[PDB]
Amino acid sequence: EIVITKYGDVYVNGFGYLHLGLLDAVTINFTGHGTDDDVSGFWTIASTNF
Amino acid sequence: TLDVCTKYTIYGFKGEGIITLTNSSFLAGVYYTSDSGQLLAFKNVTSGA
Numbered sequence: 001e002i003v004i005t006k007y008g009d010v011y012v013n014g015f016g017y018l019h020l021g022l023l024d025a026v027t028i029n030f031t032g033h034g035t036d037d038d039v040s041g042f043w044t045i046a047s048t049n050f
Numbered sequence: 051t052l053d054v055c056t057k058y059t060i061y062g063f064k065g066e067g068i069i070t071l072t073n074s075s076f077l078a079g080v081y082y083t084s085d086s087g088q089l090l091a092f093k094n095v096t097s098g099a
């Protein structure tokens with residue numbers, strides 16, 4: 001797992017490997033097409049709130 | 051150095067001690083400390099040692 005916030009910080013399996021400044025937006029791309037959905041780049045993504 | 055009394059210098063935690071192997075397992079977390087703040091057991095990434 002990888003999680004990021006509006007502040008831009010990232011946790012690697014909830015660890016916080018590297019620190020960044022404020023990130024406004026992100027564009028992501030991988031094998032996710034619809035067919036490889038079971039074996040896609042990620043598994044589940046959600047808009048989470050504190 | 052392993053299983054000997056040596057001068058450890060680890061992630062900004064330094065000192066003298068004897069290291070020992072353990073076979074625990076956790077998919078996350080790399081270091082584990084004591085109530086006082088000293089670190090006893092830990093794992094390394096690439097091998098889970």
Ligand SMILES: *[C@@H]1O[C@H](CO[C@@H]2O[C@@H](C)[C@@H](O)[C@@H](O)[C@@H]2O)[C@@H](O)[C@H](O)[C@H]1NC(C)=O
Pocket residue numbers: 072073074075
């Ligand atoms: C370490 O391994 C244990 C398995 O049995 C042990 O295997 C080796 C390491 C010898 O110590 C032998 O005498 C034992 O039979 C696990 O039960 C134990 O949980 C492991 N240690 C940790 C921290 O998980």
